Structure 1
Amino acid sequence: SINSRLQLVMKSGKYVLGYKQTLKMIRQGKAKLVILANNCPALRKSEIEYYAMLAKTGVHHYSGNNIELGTACGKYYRVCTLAIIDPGDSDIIR
């Protein structure tokens, strides 16, 4: 499961939550992975999906809706897009 591996990333690794910030992380070429909630707007997703394709970056569609993902980042707010810059000691990146 992905929730478990994220937990560790959020604890120990470096990361960034949200679309304005993750698109800046990909555009820098630092972002190693991009998680998308399922409810994300369709235009947004396809835009991000293209940005990863240009930057040769992983894109993982999360199983849950943006409330679940934010819950799954350990935040009381809700996150639709999340980039993983440096995982701490997790194998979120395979």
Structure 2
Amino acid sequence: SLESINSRLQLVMKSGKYVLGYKQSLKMIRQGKAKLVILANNCPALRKSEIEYYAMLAKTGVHHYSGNNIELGTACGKYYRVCTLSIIDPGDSDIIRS
């Protein structure tokens, strides 16, 4: 599933609710509003491990995106770069099924 994840991301971007960035992703997972977290592969190792531990506490799925932050950003369609991304809800998608 190379382009399937990208297509799902592009669909949830316009359909559901998302959170770009790290601090307000941490707020969402702490408040339990996050259903899925996506991490770029070049994010700092300590930050990555902290995110996984937080998600293990919150019983939430974490997916390691194949690309780095720049490609994650352009997959999300934003013109900046993002390391950590959160799905509040897909709305109309099957991303959280996988």
The TM-score with structure 2 as length reference comes to 0.94
User: RMSD across aligned C-alpha pairs, in angstroms?
Assistant: 0.5
> What are the ranges of 5 or more consecutive residues in structure 1 without an aligned counterpart?
none
Give yes or no for contact 1:40–1:80 (8 Å, CA) kept in 2. yes
Q: Could you list the structure 1 runs, at least 4 aligned residues long, displaced by more than 4 angstroms after superposition.
A: none
Rounded to whole Å, the distance in 1 between the matches of 2:48 and 2:63 is 11
Give yes or no for contact 1:14–1:84 (8 Å, CA) kept in 2. yes
Rounded to whole Å, the distance in 2 between the matches of 1:49 and 1:18 is 15
Give yes or no for contact 1:8–1:88 (8 Å, CA) kept in 2. no
For 1:2-43, what per-residue CA distance to the aligned partner results, in whole angstroms no more than 9, with x for missing partners?
100011100010010111010100000010000000000000
Rounded to whole Å, the distance in 2 between the matches of 1:56 and 1:2 is 21
Rounded to whole Å, the distance in 1 between the matches of 2:91 and 2:13 is 8
> What are the ranges of 5 or more consecutive residues in structure 2 without an aligned counterpart?
none
Write 1 or 2 for the structure with the bigger share of helix: 2
Rounded to whole Å, the distance in 1 between the matches of 2:48 and 2:87 is 16
The TM-score with structure 1 as length reference comes to 0.98
User: Deviation of residue 66 (structure 1)?
Assistant: 0.4
Aligned to 1:59, what secondary structure does the other structure show? strand
- Percent sequence identity over aligned pairs: 98
Aligned to 2:87, what secondary structure does the other structure show? strand
For 1:25-70, what per-residue CA distance to the aligned partner results, in whole angstroms no more than 9, with x for missing partners?
0000010000000000000000000000000000000010000000
Rounded to whole Å, the distance in 1 between the matches of 2:95 and 2:82 is 18
Rounded to whole Å, the distance in 1 between the matches of 2:34 and 2:91 is 14
Matched positions, count: 94
Give yes or no for contact 1:34–1:58 (8 Å, CA) kept in 2. yes
User: Deviation of residue 88 (structure 1)?
Assistant: 1.8
